[PDB]
Design an enzyme around this catalytic site. Structure first.
Site, PDB file in Angstrom:
ATOM      1  CE  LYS A 152       8.766  -9.291  -5.341  1.00  0.00           C
ATOM      2  NZ  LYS A 152       9.257  -8.751  -4.044  1.00  0.00           N
TER       3      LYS A 152
ATOM      4  CD  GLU B  24      12.245 -15.703  -0.022  1.00  0.00           C
ATOM      5  OE1 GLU B  24      11.602 -16.741  -0.296  1.00  0.00           O
ATOM      6  OE2 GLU B  24      11.943 -14.571  -0.463  1.00  0.00           O
TER       7      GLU B  24
ATOM      8  CD  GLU C 285      15.043 -11.521  -4.002  1.00  0.00           C
ATOM      9  OE1 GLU C 285      14.916 -12.558  -4.700  1.00  0.00           O
ATOM     10  OE2 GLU C 285      14.075 -10.968  -3.416  1.00  0.00           O
TER      11      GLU C 285
ATOM     12  CB  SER D 256      -0.985   0.000   1.176  1.00  0.00           C
ATOM     13  OG  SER D 256      -0.373  -0.480   2.363  1.00  0.00           O
TER      14      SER D 256
ATOM     15  CG  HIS E 293       9.474 -14.275   5.237  1.00  0.00           C
ATOM     16  ND1 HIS E 293       9.744 -14.366   3.888  1.00  0.00           N
ATOM     17  CD2 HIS E 293       8.665 -13.199   5.387  1.00  0.00           C
ATOM     18  CE1 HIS E 293       9.127 -13.387   3.249  1.00  0.00           C
ATOM     19  NE2 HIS E 293       8.465 -12.665   4.136  1.00  0.00           N
TER      20      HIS E 293
ATOM     21  CD  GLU F 288       7.286 -16.853   1.316  1.00  0.00           C
ATOM     22  OE1 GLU F 288       7.391 -17.690   2.253  1.00  0.00           O
ATOM     23  OE2 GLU F 288       7.558 -15.641   1.479  1.00  0.00           O
TER      24      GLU F 288
ATOM     25  CG  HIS G 292       6.149 -16.112  -5.533  1.00  0.00           C
ATOM     26  ND1 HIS G 292       7.264 -15.369  -5.199  1.00  0.00           N
ATOM     27  CD2 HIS G 292       6.199 -17.229  -4.768  1.00  0.00           C
ATOM     28  CE1 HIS G 292       7.956 -16.009  -4.271  1.00  0.00           C
ATOM     29  NE2 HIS G 292       7.335 -17.144  -3.995  1.00  0.00           N
TER      30      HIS G 292
ATOM     31  CG  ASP H  90      12.501  -8.007  -3.919  1.00  0.00           C
ATOM     32  OD1 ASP H  90      11.644  -7.363  -4.570  1.00  0.00           O
ATOM     33  OD2 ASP H  90      12.219  -8.662  -2.881  1.00  0.00           O
TER      34      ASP H  90
ATOM     35  CE  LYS I 264      11.524 -14.487  -5.211  1.00  0.00           C
ATOM     36  NZ  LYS I 264      12.265 -13.670  -4.209  1.00  0.00           N
TER      37      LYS I 264
ATOM     38  CG  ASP J 194      15.041 -12.424  -0.649  1.00  0.00           C
ATOM     39  OD1 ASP J 194      15.734 -11.504  -0.168  1.00  0.00           O
ATOM     40  OD2 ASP J 194      13.895 -12.233  -1.107  1.00  0.00           O
TER      41      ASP J 194
END
Lengths: 428, 428, 428, 428
Positions: free
Chosen positions: C339, C164, C287, C42, C155, C205, C367, C314, C390, C242
């Site tokens: 993205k 990740e 990443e 947002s 995460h 994920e 994704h 990213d 990915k 990542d």
């Protein structure tokens, strides 16, 4: 409906009065494509070979009856009932049918004819613009044209060693304006030559081959033509050269023999020469600046000039992905000249262009000496958002037909059309 | 479905890098025609006037933005809903819209572009070949090509007075062989010129303009070229000339002034000249042998030679029926050069050809100096079974695009295709 | 028929039980496309803004009723009648309608939903596969999957700093085998974790977040999992990370604070760290190894490792061309995570991928945490021949829906389908 | 047009990274259906068996190549030319082709794949919603969802014996609101678990498996989650449980061993237990409350609780009409869990549902552990106005895809949509 009901070839004529192949593909529902093949070479160790009949008592050996026969009697029966949209699958079948590296059984000219005619029939079948069939939705970029203007070396009977001098209207806001600039400069140059009492007839590419005194006089005259057309050399218009240096390279002593300048240079001295030329004249691109086998030389030229000047391999790469990957890998050049008939299928052409892009090389879509009313290469340029195209002077319909097709495509793209001028040189 | 939903013009470029008009027409059902207009004259007291913008700073005053607007903003609205197969009605409406004799309000380029786009869309709507749409079921005769090969007068910088020398392959069994003969003779001529150390760049029409010493050195060289190509001058290949005699005609004294021939002759002597030229060389045809107003000399010319030599009026008739009829009534000429854009509609074009036939005159379908990829005139020549065409050397696609169309037409016609060779001259 | 008769949005749910936008598009003839939008941010000062309702009492402020209304009541009326195959034009119109840089007026979720629904309807109208509609005839290369397998940092609740860990089956001959390899390795990993008495519930994920003691215990365990699955770590399977290093990056002191590793390092040390991690483990890709603003460190990272290790931005590029270009110009990174919903239109997406290619950068189609049954990104990856994707662990349909689409795509492609494995990394 | 021209299978992946069958059916006119099969059992004495390859070196024995082969090579040739709308006739043919009770020759997964793909192609061919093709004009009732939320027994590593706890938003006015309630309660529960420091990763059904201390603590926590989402336990939201009591039933001593509670109960004591649970917590439905062979026990439970609580047979009935009629006849249960792949055809599925209705039993349409992006069961629920559905937590697209499809169907039904909340329990 998309299935092929008919594949058909005939012998027609190219822009120089020599035979070439024309192919027509029809679907069951009447979708239609017609493609004509530009002139190639029947020999050459790294390029697809065109098949010529060699019958001395017919078109001076240049007939293409065998090639036309190959399409009608060998290629056609294999394609009947194929989905016209399976471009990749069609191209693999053609390649397999022939079974040789250089397409010398069926002929590069038979194969390309079919390869292109299917694509055109497919775009007709789907009722979409060819560049869009070829490239997907995001095909929108009109190329900067390298317009042939003055000729030398083997393409003339003068004191100029460089084979071609070209103009690139990088300062235009769109392609339509790019073309007017090229055309005005062309008419300007004609008046300039006529004033010096020089010949203004044209050669194969629609350009002039007047009896100029030297390489630099050629450059100076062109700059003069530009200024008198009312455009700014450098800012609005850059020059491009095709040195075709293989033509004055002596394999024996490994040196470059510039009869025009009356001097002999080493590869290293050639690089010094280009550097000087580039600092004096708004040259943005140089094609085949060194011999096709002078790998060590090309490496030096690229090291020296590669970040301010486009360095195009023509005879160097011969639209051959093995040659291209060798250059990429050895830091040779930063641009490749793309001739569809030198590779022989649309599929292989697009793979070649992709490999170039991924290495930060530009792919310049090219005409051949023998051209036709076909304008497929204009659509190819736009399908791949290539950014540059080389299809001759703004004279002779064999060249102007491409330019016209680009006007049509730009008009059709309307507000989605782009033209990147100087920024098309992403290799720089 | 045959109803027109869209008429659209754009500015494109001709084979000389000058703008011209392109028109597209669509029906509700997607039937589509595209036509390009060749280069006509902005003045000329008797020919339909091409509309040029005249903006000094845009294309040297040669833009056709006004004509393009005329099509899009004036003509188009009047044509929406029209049955596209109503060619006669459409042509009448165009003529009436303009309101003037010389088509100077909308422009002959705008009008002709629409006139041809409609016919091409109509053939597309009915899905029949254009020559068939134009001429009905019995359209089947391929023209003997009058192929430009050597230039002089205002079209060159040599010692030759005649403006152009052409070859006509009267001895071929079909058009395909006719075309091969012309091509082989053209390459032979080039080999010869090159041997003499003469220039072999080409002019607007695809031919050579070498520095030849004299009218007869030109003719002798062509004969030699034919001979070396392996064909019989006289029996298999004839010569045609465009004297363009207006150029060297001296108004003030009503005599003719040949710089190259190095003499001056009366009208009676010109005829004497042509007569002797005809006696020494296999010349079957002469175009504009006398001034475009020296009607009385033309009448002597036709008296002296009209029985065995074709006498073409180009500037003399200006594709104008009122001028042709005065020719016919006064026993002047036996042939007319037909230039679609000199009159302005297909309807008027076809009425001039019909008039010519009924008087035993041949009608030669002709190119212009500035051509395009458009090949309508090849269809017009077959549609009318005219028997002759003049569209250039077999070099330059602006010329060869017409030859290729004739090959396609011959090929489609198959066993019904005719080629009359020397018998095409029903006026002799 | 290609004209849009209806654009319709509704509120649906993503794989995390949060609302998102679904859009449907119909043409007059019933051609139909449906698209679902994945979860974007947002805010974020550089990425297109997703519009959330923020109603405290409805879906915890995460409703998309406003975006849905924007589609139905603002965008829809502007699109009726539009040729649905005018993707570029449609995307331009959407962008212009919004009027803002970050798409914050209509919402990036509304805009992207329409943008994708249109393309899907267009492929349907033309009855060609979406990847083909998107990329043209030469769309044929399946991506090497970067498959999430173990999670840390924000995460997870373990002692792992890296966010990740992924596996990449570079050694498979085709995508189908690539996918099998990933699945078998994932079940092996699960068997291992279960053996250590660690938790095997999955995250967003599709991967595991077990209580591992350290960054390297994670890597060692994956290697073991690969080994026990029957594959060669290094040769057949590589690792990707990542780092999400922004998370543990200390603003106040410009150093990095790894709770799990139990130390603190300078930028130069991070690189030292990665370097050593790379020396001990078959890691092919990293990443966000440094802060999304520590440009200077990124530049050191790329200097130190860019030649043999893929360095993905990213948060660094935020699928933003203006940021990518600054990366390219400053020698930062050799790869970009793409993205679609971070930028907002297919047009802008494709232009970022093209930009990346021309600079020798790979473009990894990605994704989001919140996914749907939508599988457009699989078509986008093949359309662009990107070579990498990915989209998650091979568990959870929100991930596996994309793998299945790739299987269908590979299957349809048949003999023309490619898979380049380790050679997909043209940036190395 | 309705006749089948092609039946085609491929191997794809389910939500747990295991292979499953996907089937495509095409008519002559291009009508299209694609169905994916959820995970089943390859053995089980009363259910259709799925066929697995059992090749230990490929997908851990879980490949379905044989099943895919069966469709392509055995099933397809028999269906070519069949009327796609003859659902019953297709299902009888499939059953006959296989020739065994449990579909173990061709595989339950091959057969269902075809059975469902034909139905979908038929609905596409007739251009009507699937639920309407399946159910006729009066299909309009959206089901109350049993949403998985907390997991125990064999599906967890905690002190809970009950296998699953679910929520049912019976107080919502429509399905759209039902779903928001489920989703909010789900996010509420996540925060509650996170506060206790419990794991919030998810299992197969998208629910949590935190380390709770006891059955009743699980129930209390869920009630707490509901209250904190702002809904009323009982009035607006009921609970449902799947005890999977076969899992703690000891066949040897005929008793129930609740390790969680640390007690051993007789069937009769289990009934006392449920009765107590139901009086303390707003539980509306209990699945497999007693062992699958405890017929005497089920009779008592039904006698005691059958008129205030739904009693669902899962392992009890195994979607088997002989088992169902035995329960109906012996007063056992008042509800059956319907799994399409456990019976193997749509025809048999609908007959099973009918038998349940006629006995005043509810039929709850069910997911499986291994799911896909397929949403056919949502359409089945609506086609039969079933009133309830069990497809998991409002998380993971393998579950949420069903929920989304139900939003689509409710939106499409508009004012004809019904949702009966508490009154869907016609068995009570």
């Amino acid at each position: 409906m998309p299935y092929i009901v008919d594949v058909y070839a005939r012998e027609v004529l190219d822009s120089r009065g020599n035979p070439t192949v024309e192919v027509e593909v029809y679907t069951e529902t009447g979708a239609f494509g017609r493609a004509l093949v530009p002139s190639g070479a029947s020999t050459g160790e790294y390029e697809a070979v065109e098949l010529r009949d060699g019958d001395k008592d017919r078109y001076l050996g240049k007939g293409v009856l065998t090639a036309v026969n190959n399409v009608n009697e060998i290629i056609a029966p294999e394609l009947l009932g194929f989905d016209v949209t399976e471009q990749n699958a069609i191209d693999q079948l053609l390649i397999e049918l022939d079974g040789t590296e250089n397409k010398g059984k069926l002929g590069a000219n038979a194969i390309l004819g079919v390869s292109m005619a299917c694509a055109r029939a497919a775009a007709d079948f789907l009722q979409i613009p060819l560049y869009q069939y070829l490239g997907g939705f995001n095909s929108k970029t009109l190329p900067v044209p390298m317009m042939n203007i003055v000729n030398g070396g083997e393409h003339a009977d003068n004191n100029v060693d460089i084979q071609e001098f070209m103009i690139m209207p990088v300062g235009a806001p769109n392609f339509r304006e790019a073309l007017r600039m090229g055309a005005q400069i062309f008419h300007s140059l004609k008046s300039v030559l006529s004033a010096k009492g020089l010949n203004t007839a044209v050669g194969d590419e629609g350009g002039f081959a007047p009896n100029l005194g030297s390489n630099e006089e050629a450059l100076q005259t062109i700059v003069e033509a530009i200024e008198k057309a009312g455009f700014k050399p450098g800012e609005e218009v850059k020059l491009a050269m095709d040195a075709a240096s293989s033509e004055f390279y002596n394999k024996e002593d490994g040196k470059y023999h510039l009869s025009g300048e009356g001097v002999v240079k080493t590869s290293a001295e050639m690089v010094d020469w280009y550097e000087e030329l580039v600092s004096k004249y708004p040259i943005i691109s140089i094609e085949d600046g060194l011999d096709e086998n002078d790998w060590e030389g090309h490496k030096l030229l690229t090291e020296r000039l590669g970040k301010k000047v486009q360095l195009v391999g023509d005879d160097l790469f011969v639209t051959n992905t093995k040659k291209l990957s060798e250059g990429i890998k050895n830091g040779v050049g930063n641009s490749i000249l793309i001739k569809v008939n030198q590779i022989g299928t649309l599929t292989e052409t697009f793979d070649a262009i992709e490999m170039a892009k991924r290495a930060g090389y530009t792919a310049v879509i090219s005409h051949r000496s023998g051209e036709t009313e076909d304008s497929t290469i204009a659509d190819i340029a736009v399908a791949t958002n290539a950014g540059q195209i080389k299809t001759g002077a703004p004279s002779r319909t064999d060249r102007v037909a491409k330019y016209n097709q680009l006007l049509r495509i730009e008009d059709q793209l309307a507000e989605t059309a782009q033209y990147h001028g100087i920024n098309s040189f992403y290799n720089l």
